[PDB]
Structure 1
Amino acid sequence: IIKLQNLYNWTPSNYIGDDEIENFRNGTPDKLVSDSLLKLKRLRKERILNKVLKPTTEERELYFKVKRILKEVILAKKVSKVPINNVRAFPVLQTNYNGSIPVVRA
């Protein structure tokens, strides 16, 4: 059956796999993260060598997996300190008005 509680609350990064559960229970998730980053870099190199722009689905999945692993590591307070280096600005749109002096149009 369908639950609106689930349709409203869903993202493409909601596909935990058994590898994560194992590499958490058995400790050392960092090995999984490093191997996944290496795989991402290799896939991107192969994506560059032949001219193609859109990343494949497996690249998106590896990215989502790495983000989830790091998120659950930081949330569980399993790190002593978190590095905080952020650009202390961020881009934002800006109102755009026209000039009021009319054109001569020779």
Structure 2
Amino acid sequence: IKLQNLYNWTPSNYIGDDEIENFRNGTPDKLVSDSLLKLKRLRKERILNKVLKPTTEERELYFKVKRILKEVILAKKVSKVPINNVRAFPVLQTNYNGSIPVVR
């Protein structure tokens, strides 16, 4: 039972990697293309089953895809990594009742 291997903990590290080290010796982008088609097909099977929550097989597969593209931005450092942001984000604002008292 450690501490920093126990506090630094995501859902993207329980599987480890187990496939990307073999695949990074070749191209890294083909597993990105073949798994989003599995993400689209499983989502099609989710809409055609009247279900809402994502399966554990495609959520665990989802964190695989984000780990591939991150390391290309980390180490390969893609020449754009294109910035297309809405330049806004929703925040909570304060609320208050009126100070004039109620009339019944």
Q: Contact 2:12–2:64 (CA<8 Å) still a contact in 1?
A: yes
After superposition, the C-alpha distances for 1:35-85 in whole angstroms (9 at most, x for unaligned) are 010000000000000100010101111110011111111101342221110
Q: Contact 1:23–1:29 (CA<8 Å) still a contact in 2?
A: no
Task: Give unpaired runs (5+ residues) of structure 1.
Answer: none
Task: Give unpaired runs (5+ residues) of structure 2.
Answer: none
RMSD: 1.8
3-state SS of 1:76 partner:
helix
Q: Contact 2:20–2:68 (CA<8 Å) still a contact in 1?
A: no
- Higher RCO (CA < 8 A, seq sep 6+): 2
Match status 1:10 vs 2:1:
no
State the Cα distance separating 1:12 from its structure 2 match: 1.0
Q: How does the TM-score come out when normalised to structure 2? A: 0.89
3-state SS of 1:19 partner:
coil
State the Cα distance separating 1:18 from its structure 2 match: 5.9
State the Cα distance separating 1:29 from its structure 2 match: 1.1
Q: How does the TM-score come out when normalised to structure 1? A: 0.87
Identity of paired residues, percent? 100
Q: Distance in 2 between matches of 1:30 and 1:19?
A: 17
Alignment-derived partner of residue 25 in structure 1: 24
